[PDB]
Write an enzyme that holds these catalytic residues in place. Sequence first.
Site, PDB file in Angstrom:
ATOM      1  N   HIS A 162       1.899  -1.325 -21.302  1.00  0.00           N
ATOM      2  CA  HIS A 162       1.480  -0.123 -20.560  1.00  0.00           C
ATOM      3  C   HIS A 162       0.519  -0.368 -19.398  1.00  0.00           C
ATOM      4  CE1 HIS A 162       3.354   2.747 -23.561  1.00  0.00           C
ATOM      5  NE2 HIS A 162       3.612   3.329 -22.401  1.00  0.00           N
ATOM      6  N   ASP A 381      21.727  -1.775 -11.899  1.00  0.00           N
ATOM      7  CA  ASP A 381      23.012  -2.450 -11.767  1.00  0.00           C
ATOM      8  C   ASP A 381      22.821  -3.952 -11.464  1.00  0.00           C
ATOM      9  OD1 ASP A 381      25.561  -3.307 -11.382  1.00  0.00           O
ATOM     10  OD2 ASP A 381      26.151  -1.732  -9.955  1.00  0.00           O
TER      11      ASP A 381
HETATM   12  O1  4KE Z   1       6.662   7.079 -20.088  1.00  0.00           O
HETATM   13  C1  4KE Z   1       5.958   5.985 -20.000  1.00  0.00           C
HETATM   14  C2  4KE Z   1       6.536   4.745 -19.395  1.00  0.00           C
HETATM   15  C3  4KE Z   1       7.714   4.751 -18.826  1.00  0.00           C
HETATM   16  C4  4KE Z   1       8.439   3.454 -18.524  1.00  0.00           C
HETATM   17  C5  4KE Z   1       9.831   3.454 -18.392  1.00  0.00           C
HETATM   18  C6  4KE Z   1      10.510   2.266 -18.112  1.00  0.00           C
HETATM   19  C7  4KE Z   1       9.795   1.081 -17.960  1.00  0.00           C
HETATM   20  O2  4KE Z   1      10.491  -0.135 -17.660  1.00  0.00           O
HETATM   21  C8  4KE Z   1       8.406   1.086 -18.089  1.00  0.00           C
HETATM   22  C9  4KE Z   1       7.726   2.265 -18.368  1.00  0.00           C
HETATM   23  O3  4KE Z   1       4.858   5.884 -20.646  1.00  0.00           O
HETATM   24  C10 4KE Z   1       4.353   6.986 -21.222  1.00  0.00           C
HETATM   25  C11 4KE Z   1       2.907   7.005 -21.260  1.00  0.00           C
HETATM   26  C12 4KE Z   1       2.301   8.101 -22.043  1.00  0.00           C
HETATM   27  C13 4KE Z   1       0.984   8.603 -21.754  1.00  0.00           C
HETATM   28  O4  4KE Z   1       0.441   9.307 -22.616  1.00  0.00           O
HETATM   29  O5  4KE Z   1       0.529   8.528 -20.635  1.00  0.00           O
HETATM   30  C14 4KE Z   1       3.052   8.727 -23.127  1.00  0.00           C
HETATM   31  C15 4KE Z   1       4.331   8.002 -23.575  1.00  0.00           C
HETATM   32  O6  4KE Z   1       5.205   8.956 -23.951  1.00  0.00           O
HETATM   33  C16 4KE Z   1       5.071   7.258 -22.573  1.00  0.00           C
HETATM   34  O7  4KE Z   1       5.584   6.059 -23.152  1.00  0.00           O
END
Ligand code: 4KE
Length: 434
Positions: A162, A381
Amino acid sequence: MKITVRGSEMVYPAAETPRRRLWNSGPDLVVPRFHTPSVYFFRRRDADGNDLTAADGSFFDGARMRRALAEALVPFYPMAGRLARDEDGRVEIDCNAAGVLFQEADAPDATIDYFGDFAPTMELKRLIPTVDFSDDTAFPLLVLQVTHFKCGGVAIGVGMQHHVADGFSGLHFINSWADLCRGVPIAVMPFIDRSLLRARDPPAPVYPHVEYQPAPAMLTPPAAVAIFKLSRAELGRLRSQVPAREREGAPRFSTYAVLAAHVWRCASLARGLPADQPTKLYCATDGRQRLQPPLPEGYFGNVIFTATPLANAGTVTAGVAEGAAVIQAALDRMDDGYCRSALDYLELQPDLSALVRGAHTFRCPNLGLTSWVRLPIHDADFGWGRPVFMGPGGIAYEGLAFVLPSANRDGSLSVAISLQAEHMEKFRKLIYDF
Ligand SMILES: O=C(/C=C/c1ccc(O)cc1)O[C@@H]1CC(C(=O)O)=C[C@@H](O)[C@@H]1O
Ligand SMILES: CC(C)(COP(=O)(O)OP(=O)(O)OC[C@H]1O[C@@H](n2cnc3c(N)ncnc32)[C@H](O)[C@@H]1OP(=O)(O)O)[C@@H](O)C(=O)NCCC(=O)NCCS
């Protein structure tokens, strides 16, 4: 379901990369602690039936992918780093090109269709390499796994930490990884320095930032996970239950506010929350175009601020209209001033790792609803075609949900959500009951 690891190797950047420390902004540091589980699925053929195998007979060639990987690990070089604290205890990124994990695998007995609707269940999580979290300074920031399936189908399981990137930047990398592997230059170069999201000198917050305050408690039972699709037509109906008040003058509610209010309502009814039970909905918000001036494209890291509509269950379950207003007001409130003020506010807490969002954040009676609707989750892709599905590889916490755009441009939206098992049973009957 039988799956074998064909082989795994740490991949390293395909050039020289600075061995610096990267400063992490406040937002980078309050998003959930582990890796974002993402999963793609590709079919050997379609949509008409056409074979997707390349001319050269390749279909997701490991060697070709490890090669692009290494290249893309050059601009996006901190993807290769590791987590290090600082002269205070403040998590930052140690860019030490210690590489990302890549690895091939085989599902000989099963097609991809084994996963059915692709709910982010337990089973789906295995498509992602398992990490040992017990030494956060050790594990790589990006683990990868390409699984080949009994009928030519392929699955890419992604595990991105994250602190490094949000959906926007994370997908920037993955999509860029797939761009190279397809023989195309990266259209937009990652900006590595996260200076732009630094607090003001000195900090001057003008809000108390409800989003960072302790979620409401009730005035552990294992969690079930499911995914629910709502067609463009159902969404229309739901929307029509929200009378666009003429005499008011205000703009219509966004689709998110409406869908979210409906989910918040179904979840609250499903959990049997009494009318006076307060409930908080967490909504990750992209500050890229909230902030002024806009962040430069390619900005690399989290620009996630958090909108937390808060109301009594009675308000939320009384109807979609009343929940959507609460949500929409919470969202409209995220302007340049509010976001910048949140920066200042985080710069004042001692230990930010107490503000990290986790199970305590999202569990009953509260909720998280993260929208990927705007994210290019179907753009990856690699040379063998666009995936047929991508979504979370698992949902860590009870109470967390995601909204997902349709893979096939049909205008439908899907909600993937984890609840307590007994609540999920009810929720299945509520979510379409309108
Ligand atoms: O939604 C994201 C990340 C998306 C993501 C998608 C593809 C990728 O390769 C990397 C990150 O993080 C979010 C962060 C978050 C928060 O409270 O700020 C709550 C979670 O539901 C999610 O996981
Ligand atoms: C702000 C947020 C709550 C709603 O996101 P959204 O789906 O873009 O919709 P918003 O409520 O921000 O925007 C208002 C409306 O304008 C639309 N819109 C405006 N500009 C747009 C663009 N460039 N692309 C797509 N939609 C756009 C939105 O889709 C939205 O819905 P509508 O179709 O009902 O009108 C939040 O989900 C968001 O910022 N999402 C972007 C991606 C994101 O948040 N990722 C987080 C994962 S880490």
